[PDB]
Amino acid sequence: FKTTEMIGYVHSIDGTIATLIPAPGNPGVAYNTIIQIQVSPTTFAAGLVFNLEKDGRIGIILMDNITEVQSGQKVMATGQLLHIPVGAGVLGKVVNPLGHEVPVGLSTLGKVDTGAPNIVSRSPVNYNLLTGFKAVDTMIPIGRGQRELIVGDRQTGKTSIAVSTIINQVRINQQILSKNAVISIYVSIGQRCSNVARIHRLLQSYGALRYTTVMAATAAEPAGLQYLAPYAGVTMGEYFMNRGRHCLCVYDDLSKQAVAYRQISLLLRRPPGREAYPGDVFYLHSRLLERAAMLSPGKGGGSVTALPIVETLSNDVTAYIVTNVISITDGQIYLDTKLFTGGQRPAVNIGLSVSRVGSSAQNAAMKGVAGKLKGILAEYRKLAQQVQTIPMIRGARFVALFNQKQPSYFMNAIVSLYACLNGYLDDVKVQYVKFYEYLLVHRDLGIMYGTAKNKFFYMYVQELNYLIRFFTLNSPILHGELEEMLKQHTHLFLQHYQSKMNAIKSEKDVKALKNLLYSCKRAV
Amino acid sequence: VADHKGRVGHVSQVIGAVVDVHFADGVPPVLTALDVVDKLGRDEPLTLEIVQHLDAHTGRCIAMQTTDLLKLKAKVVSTGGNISVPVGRETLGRIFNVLGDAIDQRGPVGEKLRMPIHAVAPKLADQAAEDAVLTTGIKVIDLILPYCKGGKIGLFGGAGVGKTVIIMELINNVAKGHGGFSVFAGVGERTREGTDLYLEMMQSKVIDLKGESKCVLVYGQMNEPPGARARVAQSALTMAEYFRDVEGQDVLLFIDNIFRFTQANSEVSALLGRIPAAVGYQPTLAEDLGQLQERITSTTKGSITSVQAVYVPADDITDPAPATTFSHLDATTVLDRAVAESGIYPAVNPLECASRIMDPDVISVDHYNVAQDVVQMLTKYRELQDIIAVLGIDELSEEDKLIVDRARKLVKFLSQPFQVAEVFTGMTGHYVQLDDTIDSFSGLLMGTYDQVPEMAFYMVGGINSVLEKAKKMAEEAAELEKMRRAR
Ligand SMILES: Nc1ncnc2c1ncn2[C@@H]1O[C@H](COP(=O)(O)OP(=O)(O)O)[C@@H](O)[C@H]1O
Ligand SMILES: Nc1ncnc2c1ncn2[C@@H]1O[C@H](COP(=O)(O)OP(=O)(O)O)[C@@H](O)[C@H]1O
């Protein structure tokens, strides 16, 4: 940072907060500005101004080198609000809320304190944002500029579903024009340090670091950084938004931000209310999430999509911080603990989950299949000794298809859902749906055996993805050609591949069948 | 070099354990240890750690010992930096307090170096890129809820279920398989429980007086004031950090109890004048656990792997003290009393247990698939156990009877005779290898050991010991049958 004038001396410290006495003359620093405390002749320690008392004293929120801060040290002022490095050059790197880059193993600035776009500045959300999950992209579809909450207990897949959404963009972003590329911003508030490292390696292996920048305020780092981390995350996204490009922002998580803000408020004797949080803990998350938006044609038509994560304690939505964030965001993606342990991963509770702008957000092709799935799963959940209708058969296969570790590509998802919709997996049993889906995507049975003879439509040709998005499956161009592919795949799978299940009644073969089927759950 | 080294100050105010100190030449830094030089009316010394600064010349502190007989204006002198604790192999075998003074009456420690208690947690670059399995040599742990390198591990279990026995076995088994040492943070523990650990370790020879020791004890007990009980968790962690960073080694840490760290900080935080957050805990509850638990991690240099006890107050799991801790933990080990009383030791109930590294990416595909089948089979067995109670054993199907025979053997084979518990069991211990554990359980699921009897699997380690006991059972059953084929 840029020093200007020596405004005062350090008087008191109380962990991560301090107060200053003014230097002779009483210069008086400006409000909400950064100030550099000289911890040594060579080194400085940043801090934000929160109180300007009548006495001349100035309240400081400490940020860097907190152990090195002492009473009687000199304090230089910037006379400016907190600006940070933002742009394309910051991508593929880990950074603090203050802007300092973090080393990892082996650019015009922007204001963090900024007002959100007003009423005429925004527009309705039309551009889709693919999470890469059949459960989410059909039932709870996220649009670009939307704020979609992720709620649920610890170890329910809140991070993984958010991180895989960033990883899902690489396959599109590589192929598409960079104007429509989804640049991601993963904010890590209050997390463990090794968890950030594992996400860095996981982003690097899938080529995500090229189209991603990692905001990081770990549990070791103070509450001042944790408080400010989501704000620094949005600032970096708003650069892309205001310059006519689309962006994604994950805050993992706002629960730990609130706890950091509560620490700051309680330590400065701010009157606490519900669950010991201050009065303005709603205002904290509100001004953050409202800065995420979909701008108008008049201001570039860019976007910042928000995926705030909020941890619940034993499926209790009535908690103060959880109920606040639900009332701000445009619906949620609820992750149930019983569904996680039950088998379904991601454990998306479709009844509890909701998207407030779902229909308009979806693609024309995805809107066709998904509209029917709501009718089938509604009847399946209600109807759930035995007695099987067509909805009961086809409904159960959808549940088997929604299980996935890594995100599915838009073509590979919609075709496997279209098969189940028109009833191509009815004769196929429930346990062999993932083996059926694997052999559809990677392999192909028509080209294998003999009975192929399709002129264009195959699954190995990944470029058909964007033709499907334009014309849809229910269309005179692709309908007849698609229904061949599926008819060849079902008849050959039932005849040649599913015939083994009546056979195979021995120990080294039943175990071989299991290990095959287990691995099929991972790869979609 | 070391500035502010012997900088003199005087005691400004004394309100309980919290003590203010006036320094003439400016106040030292935060977390700086200060020895109270004045007076010889006390029987033990007094050492103050600065927590806050009030002005340029005054600094507020917390007492590690009692503040009895402390007059105003008493002479106080700085140490040089933070509270310093001895490290290295000279610490092994000895007992210590929060400060690092030997409390076992066995002469002066050999200390070639001292490190500060308040170290900073490792950066992103220092973290491991290979989530790696820490082979404990125990069947239930390694198979179902494997402990990882760098892992925070949690030991859930009521009074008298096998906690102290499992910690002692891990101290042995770390030293067998990785050659590693161990550290025991007695955080807010009973002083009388500390004796029984010291004696039982001396009997089992993990600590040895005359010879080689493979354990360190750092105790900050209930009798001590909150300042000690708060900081004593970090003292032990500094010693484990030396074996991790400098010596480059796999190390175990044992914090009993991590709630007592949070509770000790809740006492000082009240006396410091801070406004309490939810349920009367300190407002820095998440931050206190943050800076402690983040230091416990697998670096590139070594790996500390902390097993922890966590008290759930009033059996309320939604309470902040456990709820905040749950995010930090990797492998949750749950010990059940009914499992212990039935005969299975260690008393690990595998269904309530879980591990983060139970994943096809981290461990091998053969490890995950076999481990899941044990969990699946035991889940089916509990459903079948309710049917046999109602209907009967004969009422079950042909395939379901064979699942019961295997599942009964799985429960028995999960038991293991511990090497530290030779006195209790009356049989020699068994370190079971990870390759042995996976293969033996894999074959049992296949049905390769269907003809092997059930009690062969009870209290043994690995398939060679199962077939050895089954041979002894076949021979002894042949003799007793021949006796009744005569009388
Ligand atoms: N779709 C999925 N399929 C299989 N495993 C998953 C999936 N999503 C998450 N997991 C696993 O579940 C565990 C918890 O996930 P995580 O996203 O960290 O939950 P949280 O964010 O609530 O802590 C991790 O070990 C992760 O690998
Ligand atoms: N592996 C084991 N083998 C045999 N007995 C055991 C084993 N573990 C625990 N026990 C028995 O359980 C009792 C209580 O275990 P212990 O760990 O001492 O409880 P606590 O941790 O409450 O002190 C012991 O007296 C011992 O006989």
Ligand SMILES: [Mg+2]
């Ligand atoms: Mg998470």
